Design a binder for this molecule. Structure first.
Ligand SMILES: CCC(=O)SCCNC(=O)CCNC(=O)[C@H](O)C(C)(C)COP(=O)(O)OP(=O)(O)OC[C@H]1O[C@@H](n2cnc3c(N)ncnc32)[C@H](O)[C@@H]1OP(=O)(O)O
Length: 318
């Protein structure tokens, strides 16, 4: 069977799915179909500190040369007209309790994408927020302490996950996307899922951050390349770092899942799900490449239904 439901289930996927369908049952809209959330790939990686930061801080013994993390790719599918339609995807990076500072017990959303065919339309945004809120709730329970978001919308024609978006699906500019995450986090706050969130500038200030080595270092994030430039441009760049953090502060969220002294007393983070080896969905380039090479577009509902079928056949028949 090629259905989204028969894709391998996980605790993480089930938690998100249960939250979404719970919310949909409260809404009682007759157009809404069942939602399936599936983790389709999961692997362990390391991000290596780039050469400039490495020469300054790693070789003097002040910073780890690399940080291990688990990366997960997940998809949400909805029943529409009796078939599965993939409508949302997200990749995450999880730096567990064996990861050295400054990354210990942190999660980072690498990127997220969607195709706007969720039915009914009036519930689409709410469903996206429930998935994100569910993810924060889950990693909090496992023992992650801080979550990180970079609110950077794609450039015109740069598909993040889904090849060929619908032509009439508008791309939010930074201001709209920032408020969209704020709305999501405000709802997470009201449910006691997060303790607070802050911008990166306010966070560094409260932490009295004085060196670039204290800034969490994530694969593909803004800051490692900024830091390479600060070291090339050139002495202590800490003053300029605060100007850079301040200039871009609205787009960089720091989310506190736990706060206070408990954060140094938590048990080890042990992931109850196995890794899921799926080269096609690990990273974004493979799936984009495959869809491009096979003319799998998501630019209308009919094409999205077809491309979802083809993706499910690929996922099942490795
Ligand atoms: C940390 C790293 C990451 O998370 S990646 C950064 C976020 N990811 C992306 O931007 C990928 C592409 N974007 C998307 O897939 C979606 O926009 C996401 C982010 C999922 C949000 O979708 P959604 O919940 O529908 O909110 P939305 O703001 O996109 O649409 C709401 C209404 O606003 C409109 N809108 C959008 N952009 C504009 C615009 N530039 N000018 C005028 N209007 C705009 C939309 O048309 C939409 O209208 P409507 O009220 O739903 O009919």
């Amino acid at each position: 069977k090629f259905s989204a439901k028969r894709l391998q289930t996980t605790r993480l996927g089930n938690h998100l799915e249960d939250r979404v369908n719970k919310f949909l049952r409260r809404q009682n809209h007759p157009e809404a179909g069942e939602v399936f959330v599936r983790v389709v790939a999961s692997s362990d990686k390391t991000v290596e500190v780039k050469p400039g930061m490495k020469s300054r801080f790693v070789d003097s013994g002040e910073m780890s040369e690399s940080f291990p993390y688990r990366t997960k790719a997940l998809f949400a599918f909805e029943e529409i007209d009796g078939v599965d339609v993939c409508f949302f995807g997200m990749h995450v990076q999880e730096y567990g309790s064996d990861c050295p500072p400054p990354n210990t017990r942190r999660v980072y959303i690498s990127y997220l994408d969607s195709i706007h065919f969720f039915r009914p339309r009036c519930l689409r945004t709410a469903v996206y927020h429930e998935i994100l809120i569910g993810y924060l709730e889950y990693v909090k329970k496992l023992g992650y302490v801080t979550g990180h978001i970079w609110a950077c919308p794609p450039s015109e024609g740069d598909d993040y996950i889904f090849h060929c978006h619908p032509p009439d699906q508008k791309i939010p500019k930074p201001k709209r996307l920032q408020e969209w995450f704020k709305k999501m986090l405000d709802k997470a706050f009201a449910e006691r899922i997060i303790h607070d969130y802050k911008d990166i500038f306010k966070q560094a200030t409260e932490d009295r951050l004085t060196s670039a080595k204290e800034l969490p270092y994530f694969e593909g994030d803004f800051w490692p390349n900024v830091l390479e430039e600060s070291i090339k441009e050139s002495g202590s760049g800490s003053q300029k770092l605060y100007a850079t953090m301040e200039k871009h502060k609205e787009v960089f969220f720091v989310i506190h899942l736990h706060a206070g002294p408990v954060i140094n007393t938590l048990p080890p983070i042990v992931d109850p799900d196995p890794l899921l080896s799926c080269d096609l969905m690990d990273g974004r380039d493979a799936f984009l490449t495959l869809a491009r090479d096979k003319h799998w577009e998501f630019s209308s509902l009919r094409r999205s239904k077809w491309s979802t079928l083809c993706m499910l056949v690929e996922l099942h028949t490795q």
